[PDB]
């Protein structure tokens, strides 16, 4: 929350749709991290269809900037709620106000030139408390195309990968929901046909000695971009209408 | 050259206390007090939760039906669960509960070396009549700050995808403040006192702390 | 910037400060006088230099 | 108003207090301003920029 | 694989090997200056204050 | 949860009186506590003997002029401070400056006592001008556990006891294998010649160890 405010932040928090605002006043029947169910007062209530106002909260999902947008309930079980009151906080909003960051203890003084120009010198207490930590949500895609050499397979059978590589994938070639990955990990196995490598003499000798069959298939599999690491919160499979959906899908 | 020794160790709250060192020579109250501040805040034994495996959960970013806390917030709440052991360097606690109401730190399954210093400490709430959360809360012991990130180098089949690593909080110490007040033993020219007022989660006794602190301090002098 | 505020604060003189008027053998015991809290960073003092 | 609220706080009017270097433990000369400043993390984050 | 042994080899190839550092508005020739690389844990470049 | 200990890898010492020693690898943050603590001890409290007071044969005052000496009396006092005096079981000793002539008075021109040892016969006390130039006097030393200034003798010469003429510590990053960032702590120190720097450190931290003997256990 801002410790030093203005009094506008409340208005920004509410007017912007990031929060979840009560349609009608009443008592809270149910509070889940998923949803919030409110029992309406009669004076605000329409005669027909009785009612309760059910609010389905947005859960962890990809924002436009590749940040995370997630709503949290600010109310508890069986609480009075006025009409036009905040039922849930959006990202960067606290208790119905706008918190775009965090307030902290700050001291103005040169410290060993580590603050030199505009530079900022921050205690380990902050990085430990995980307060300035941020959750990014990235959307990666794997495209199965059609090449004149043949169609591309999403199959989990990938030329030249260890059992450790094919472990995080199911039988169908897609990564399990929830598996934490890093750079180099294969999210989706994809292989495209390229036949007749047309190798050279020494390579042919090598193959003659080691008796390896050079595959007619090339590895196009979508892998996590180098250096970035996180957890898988969802997977979607779009299929051309009429093509047989694989096992995973 | 009179060597110092401690004196009354006054417990105020389960949280913090003021310890004291009586026989201090010229300027040595600072020479000691600051070094001791340093070693106290930094290097200390502590036991914090590391790996948590919950009921139906693949990852910390989902929600469990029947509890208003997101898995992320629950893990964060667990990181702040203070415990203490005796004869084990890792102990795996068992948490079970159901029914509508708060799930506190006392709802776990007590073990031989388990001591819950804050039984009222909140894990997460329970919003529905029949909903039940079971978790194996793996709590080990160590030093300093080990983030969940640096934890995977070793790896070696961490495959139980339901296992969520959290950052290591290990440390008893919250705040250390030393004061040097002139202390007059009944007869001497001039001497000072070291009042070391520390702050803890209650998982370490003051004398234990200050002792192992001084211990490591001298242990670095081993050069000669 | 920071550095010049450092050297400026270093060599400057106030009217009255710890160790005012005394005398020292050389820069060594001057610094030793300062770090021990006996003499103030800025005080008018005669010292021998080479 | 701010100083008046600082009185209610038990904290000095100057907004500055005594601070000690966590390294040497000795006091910093002069008072320094300490307070609570609301701060934002913009997303320029270095593991993007690199 | 970033095997343990490669970091030392990198410390070998880095030693006497300078690198060129440059900023966005290059005006005078000092806009580019050569430095001796020092291996640092982080994603940020560290540049001497006097420069 | 086992702990890291160093031992000094390098002692790089210029001449005799001066020494610069490097110590590594340390734990993160330990370089500054070691360095600072040892620095405060080395500086503010050390055993040593120097000149507390010197009677002036010529005059009664610090402000005057001697016959045969261009040095102001305070300048001579300065030189007196820089005299290296290591005394034996004799707790207090007094010497005499006896010499006269056209030549500069050194520290070898002082009288020789039993328990007295001067480290520098070269040390310049005062110069003598032409002819006779009446000079000689008696110098009274003392003992101290710290550094005692001139004004501090309240009820005049600054008493410089601690052998250390300077102490500095540079804490810079140390690298060990798979251990990311460590402390490489470099102590540099100067002495007045009485005790060599190397053992001066040893006794200095022996003081600390003694201060700590009332607390620890185990490793021993």
Say if B191 is an interface residue toward chain F (CB within 8 Å). no
- The reply to whether F48-161 shares the fold of F1-47+162-220 is no
CA–CA separation, A147 vs A191, rounded Å? 12
CA neighbor of A32 nearest in space, from A45, A20, A42: A20
In this structure, what DSSP letter does residue D6 have?
H
Q: Closest to A108 (Cβ–Cβ): which among D32, D39, D41? A: D32
E contacts of D50 (beta carbons < 8 Å): 43
CA–CA separation, F129 vs F103, rounded Å? 7
For tokens 């060192």, the residue is: B21
Q: Closest to D38 (Cβ–Cβ): which among A4, A108, A109? A: A4
H/E element holding C26?
none
For tokens 């790996």, the residue is: B51
Q: How was this structure determined?
A: X-ray
Q: Which residues pair with residue B181 across a beta bridge? A: B193
F contacts of B38 (beta carbons < 8 Å): 29, 32-33
Q: How far from F93 is each of F55, F78, F89, F113, F137, CA to CA, in Å?
A: 14, 20, 10, 8, 14
The CATH homologous superfamily of the domain defined by B1-45+171-224: RNA polymerase, RBP11-like subunit (3.30.1360.10)
Q: How far from C2 is each of C5, E48, F132, F168, CA to CA, in Å?
A: 5, 14, 58, 22
CB B60 within 8 A of CB B164: yes
For domain F1-47+162-220, the question of CATH label 3.30.1360.10 is answered with yes
In this structure, what DSSP letter does residue A117 have?
S
Q: In terms of DSSP H, where are the helices of chain A?
A: 9-15, 124-129, 201-210
CA–CA separation, B196 vs A244, rounded Å? 73
Q: In terms of DSSP H, where are the helices of chain B?
A: 28-42, 71-79, 148-151, 206-219
CATH architecture of B46-170: Beta Complex (2.170)
A18-92 fold: OB fold (Dihydrolipoamide Acetyltransferase, E2P) (2.40.50)
CB B73 within 8 A of CB B62: no
CA–CA separation, B196 vs B20, rounded Å? 6
CB A214 within 8 A of CB A207: yes
Q: Touching B: which chains, 3+ CB pairs < 8 A?
A: A, D, F
CA–CA separation, F124 vs D24, rounded Å? 37
A contacts of C5 (beta carbons < 8 Å): 110
Helix axes of B28-42 and F30-44: crossing angle, nearest 10 degrees: 170
Count CB pairs under 8 A between chains B and F.
93
Phi, psi of C9 (to 5 degrees): -60, -40
C contacts of A110 (beta carbons < 8 Å): 2, 5-6
Q: Which two tokens stand for residue A189?
A: 């196995």
Q: Collapse the DSSP code of B162 into the 3-class scheme (helix H, G, I; strand E, B; otherwise coil) and give the result.
A: coil
Nearest CA in chain F to C23: F78
Do chains A and B meet with 3 or more Cβ pairs nearer than 8 Å? yes
Say if D21 is an interface residue toward chain F (CB within 8 Å). no
Q: How many Cα neighbours within 13 Å face the side chain of F63?
A: 0
In this structure, what DSSP letter does residue A228 have?
-
Q: Collapse the DSSP code of F34 into the 3-class scheme (helix H, G, I; strand E, B; otherwise coil) and give the result.
A: helix
CA–CA separation, B46 vs B28, rounded Å? 29
In this structure, what DSSP letter does residue E31 have?
G
Q: Which residues pair with residue A106 across a beta bridge? A: D35
Helix axes of B206-219 and F197-211: crossing angle, nearest 10 degrees: 170
CB F190 within 8 A of CB F164: yes
Nearest CA in chain E to D49: E43
Count CB pairs under 8 A between chains A and B.
64
CATH of domain A133-243: 2.40.50.150
Say if F15 is an interface residue toward chain E (CB within 8 Å). no
CA–CA separation, F82 vs C28, rounded Å? 11
**What is chain B's length?**
224
CA–CA separation, F3 vs A47, rounded Å? 74
- Domain ranges for chain B, please list them: 1-45+171-224, 46-170
- How buried is B54 (Cβ within 10 angstroms: 0-12 exposed, 13-18 middle, 19+ buried)? buried
CA–CA separation, A192 vs A213, rounded Å? 17
CA–CA separation, A1 vs A6, rounded Å? 12
F48-161 fold: RNA Polymerase Alpha Subunit; Chain A, domain 2 (2.170.120)
CA–CA separation, F54 vs B193, rounded Å? 37
CA–CA separation, F191 vs F193, rounded Å? 5
CA–CA separation, B103 vs F183, rounded Å? 44
Q: Collapse the DSSP code of F58 into the 3-class scheme (helix H, G, I; strand E, B; otherwise coil) and give the result.
A: coil
As a three-state string, the secondary structure of A35-103 is EEEEEECCCCCCCCCCCCEEEECCCCEECCCCEEECCEECCCCCCEECCCCEEEECCCEECCEECCCEE
CA neighbor of F153 nearest in space, from F52, F21, F16, F36: F52
Angle at B84 between CA B82 and CA B90, to 5 degrees: 105
CA–CA separation, C16 vs C44, rounded Å? 8
For tokens 């020219």, the residue is: B189
F190 upstream amide cis, omega within 30 of 0: no
CA–CA separation, A30 vs A39, rounded Å? 9
A contacts of D33 (beta carbons < 8 Å): 107-109
Q: How far from F74 is each of C27, F62, F63, F70, F84, CA to CA, in Å?
A: 17, 6, 7, 11, 18
C contacts of A115 (beta carbons < 8 Å): 2
Q: Which two tokens stand for residue C4?
A: 């010049």
Q: How far is A154 from chain B (nearest CA, A)?
A: 23
Q: How far from B131 is each of A31, B74, B137, B160, E13, CA to CA, in Å?
A: 13, 16, 19, 23, 61
């Amino acid at each position: 929350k801002p410790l030093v405010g203005t009094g506008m932040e409340r208005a920004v928090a509410v007017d912007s749709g990031v929060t979840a605002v009560a349609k009608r006043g009443g008592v809270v029947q149910y509070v889940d991290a998923s949803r919030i169910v409110i029992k309406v007062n009669e004076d605000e209530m329409y005669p027909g269809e009785a009612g309760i106002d059910i609010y389905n909260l947005t859960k962890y999902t990809r924002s436009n900037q590749n940040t995370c947008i997630n709503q949290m309930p600010c109310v508890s079980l069986g609480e009075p709620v006025e009409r036009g009151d905040v039922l849930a906080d959006g990202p960067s909003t606290d208790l119905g106000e706008l918190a775009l960051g965090q307030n902290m203890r700050v001291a103005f003084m040169p410290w060993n030139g580590y603050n030199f120009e505009d530079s900022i010198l921050v205690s380990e207490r902050v990085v430990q408390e995980d307060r300035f930590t941020t959750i990014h949500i990235q959307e990666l895609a794997c495209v199965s195309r059609d090449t004149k050499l043949g169609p591309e397979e999403i199959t989990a059978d990938i030329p030249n990968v260890g059992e450790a590589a094919l472990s995080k994938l199911d039988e169908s070639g897609i990564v399990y929901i929830g598996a934490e990955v890093t750079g180099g990990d294969i999210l989706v196995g994809k292989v495209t046909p390229k036949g007749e490598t047309q190798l050279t003499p020494e390579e042919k000798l090598l193959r003659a000695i080691f008796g390896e069959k050079a595959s007619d298939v090339k590895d196009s599999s979508l892998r996590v971009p180098n250096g970035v690491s996180g957890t898988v919160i969802d997977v979607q499979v779009f299929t051309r209408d009429g093509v047989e959906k694989d096992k995973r899908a | 050259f009179l060597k110092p020794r401690l004196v009354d160790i006054e417990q105020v709250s389960s949280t913090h206390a003021k310890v004291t060192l009586e026989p201090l020579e010229r300027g040595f109250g600072h020479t000691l007090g600051n070094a001791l501040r340093r070693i106290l805040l930094s290097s200390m034994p502590g036991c914090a939760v590391t790996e948590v495996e919950i009921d139906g959960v693949l990852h910390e970013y989902s929600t469990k039906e029947g509890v208003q806390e997101d898995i992320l917030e629950i893990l964060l709440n667990l990181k702040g669960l203070a415990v203490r052991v005796q004869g084990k360097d890792e102990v795996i606690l068992t948490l079970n509960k159901s029914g509508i109401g708060p799930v506190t730190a006392a709802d776990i399954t007590h073990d031989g070396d388990v001591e819950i210093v804050k039984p009222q400490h909140v894990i997460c709430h329970l919003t529905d009549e029949n909903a039940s959360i079971s978790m194996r809360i793996k709590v080990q012991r160590g030093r300093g700050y080990v983030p969940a990130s640096t934890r995977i180098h070793s790896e070696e089949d961490e495959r139980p995808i339901g296992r969520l690593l959290v950052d290591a909080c290990y440390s008893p110490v919250e705040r250390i403040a030393y004061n040097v007040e002139a202390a007059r033993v009944e007869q001497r020219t001039d001497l000072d006192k070291l009042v070391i007022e520390m702050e803890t989660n209650g998982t370490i006794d003051p004398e234990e702390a200050i002792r192992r602190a001084a211990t490591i301090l001298a242990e670095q002098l081993e050069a000669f | 910037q920071d550095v010049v505020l450092g050297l400026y604060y270093m060599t400057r003189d106030c009217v009255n400060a710890k160790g005012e008027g005394m005398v020292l053998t050389g820069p060594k015991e001057a610094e030793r006088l300062y770090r021990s809290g006996l003499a103030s960073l800025h005080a008018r003092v005669k010292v021998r230099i080479t | 108003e701010i100083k008046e609220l600082l009185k209610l706080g038990d904290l000095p009017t100057s907004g500055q207090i005594r601070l000690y270097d966590g390294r040497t433990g000795e006091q910093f000369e002069r008072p320094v301003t300490v307070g609570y400043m609301y701060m934002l993390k913009l997303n320029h984050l270095v593991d993007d920029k690199m | 694989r970033e095997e343990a042994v490669v970091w030392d080899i990198l410390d070998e190839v880095i030693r006497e090997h300078p690198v060129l550092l440059n900023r966005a508005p290059t005006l005078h020739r000092l806009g580019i200056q050569a430095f001796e690389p020092v291996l640092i844990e982080g994603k940020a470049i560290q540049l001497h204050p006097l420069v």
